[PDB]
Design a protein around this ligand. Sequence first.
Ligand SMILES: [Fe+2]
Length: 154
Amino acid sequence: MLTYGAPFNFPRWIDEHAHLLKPPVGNRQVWQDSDFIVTVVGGPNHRTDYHDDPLEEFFYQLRGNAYLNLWVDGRRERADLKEGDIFLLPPHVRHSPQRPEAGSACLVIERQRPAGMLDGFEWYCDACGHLVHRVEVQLKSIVTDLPPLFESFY
Ligand SMILES: [Fe+2]
């Protein structure tokens, strides 16, 4: 049979999950236990961490707008994700995804990292532009391997 089920209307499925696409949660993963981690991410949410992902991430901004703060060539650059945009982020490229809008929704796709492949999270000094903290973490379930990880800084 079909491990990950039938095809379904995306719009509807998004609408039926609007409640789940804003705080305290924000995001909602479409299929469970897939190599391809396919998620919709909502708003609003802002964050202070930069993600260094050892695999690429694919983004598609189905509704409203957002942006990525990026650490490029030792410089604090930014990438708009207006409504409509797609984008393929390289691995290890440092990114902080900012979703201001209530009712925005972005498709985000990623691979389960294999055992040995680590993610990094890091925060940066707004002043002296220097790396303040960095964790490396073996990601496996992106709701258990993250909320503590986040809270021992704030
Ligand atoms: Fe990320």
